[PDB]
């Protein structure tokens, strides 16, 4: 019970940061170099 104000603060902070990120980085991470004339993402051995 006594964690109620802390829970509300965490919820409000998560909401603010979600909205901020939604404004700034909305749709940027949608490009990666495939192979030319191919739909195979090109990465080195251990890269993600």
């Amino acid at each position: 019970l006594p964690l109620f104000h802390i829970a509300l603060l965490v919820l409000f902070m998560v909401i603010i940061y979600a909205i901020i990120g939604l404004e700034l980085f909305k749709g940027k991470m949608h490009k990666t170099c495939y192979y030319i004339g191919t739909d195979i993402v090109a990465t080195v051995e251990n890269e993600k």
Partner: protein
Amino acid sequence: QPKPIGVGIPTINLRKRRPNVQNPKSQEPVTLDFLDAELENDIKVEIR
């Protein structure tokens, strides 16, 4: 003739082929039946 005999219409998908991976080749023999190297009669099947 020295070319390998074919089966079905060939279909290759370029969009899913890395550039340098050396997709392998075939080991099939050249098995061309007798009634497929000439025109088939009802007499040539008898001779065969």
